[PDB]
Amino acid sequence: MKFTVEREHLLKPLQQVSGPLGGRPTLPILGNLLLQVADGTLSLTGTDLEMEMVARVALVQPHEPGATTVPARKFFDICRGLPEGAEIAVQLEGERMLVRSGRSRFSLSTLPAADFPNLDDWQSEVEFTLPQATMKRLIEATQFSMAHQDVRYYLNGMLFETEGEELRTVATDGHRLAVCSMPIGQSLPSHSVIVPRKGVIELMRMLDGGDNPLRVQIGSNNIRAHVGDFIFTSKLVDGRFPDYRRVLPKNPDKHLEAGCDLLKQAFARAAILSNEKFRGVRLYVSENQLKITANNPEQEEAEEILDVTYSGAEMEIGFNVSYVLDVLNALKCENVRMMLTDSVSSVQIEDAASQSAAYVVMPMRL
């Protein structure tokens, strides 16, 4: 295997493919990148067994076919450490790979390419293309609501659903939930799959905000996304994900509308004096007014009064202020609508001028 290529043509690919690597976790081989030269193309692959990130680079200079694996971090650091505009010549020398540039020489240890983990072949059952920004909006709008290390591992991921002419994402940890849907102009079969937490992050990080669209392929046990010269593929999580339709409040008759930023800043200041453990704050809703209060064990107290639009009945309701702030931070709109029922029922929050995304938060008891 042999190839010479510009430093800048390797940086992004190396950065992207090193994404699935959690340092030196499982097998030693997983800390290595798979290098393969076939045709006039160099392929780089990083994996963690659960997912895989593949980069393809055009080889305009002379090359020889072959494959091997090398330590990801070191190879990347070497390439990054070389001067800008540097030509990097790489050649496999038996058990080691020689990297040369200018008067800099590096010999890296290898591991048989034949032993590099690879996701078994699978077949896609659903395919569609959509703008990168759309996939970005979908993930960002709900990512913060995925569970982290919950026993019900199926919650430690994000649901991706194709329904009608829309793609939807759902995330929840049992206390709060986020759902968002966008139209892709393509008639799609009804399908639902759970993407592992790390896959969601990798997918998100894989977007360059470019104009080039994203090609998504979904199978019974895998999901794949092609962006430019990168191909990401991840296994899916098994288990029945809760139905957001069953979680959305059934009778949120009381509707409060307020400026998202004044609301966020008020909750932010009040949170300072909330219990560090439970983060509870109290909301007192009255005609066109919202009063937010917080107190902690040492009996300190925060009180915020805001003008809002509300004509319903008076009520008090508690919430984990972090869950509320997470929502207001994700909405980043002008005004938000809070739809309540009672003090022991969840609340649905959403942009006052858009129902494409909805958030559900269970109140706290106190």
Partner: peptide, 6 residues
């Protein structure tokens, strides 16, 4: 304390 959606 905290309530659960499901």
């Amino acid at each position: 304390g905290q309530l659960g959606l499901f």
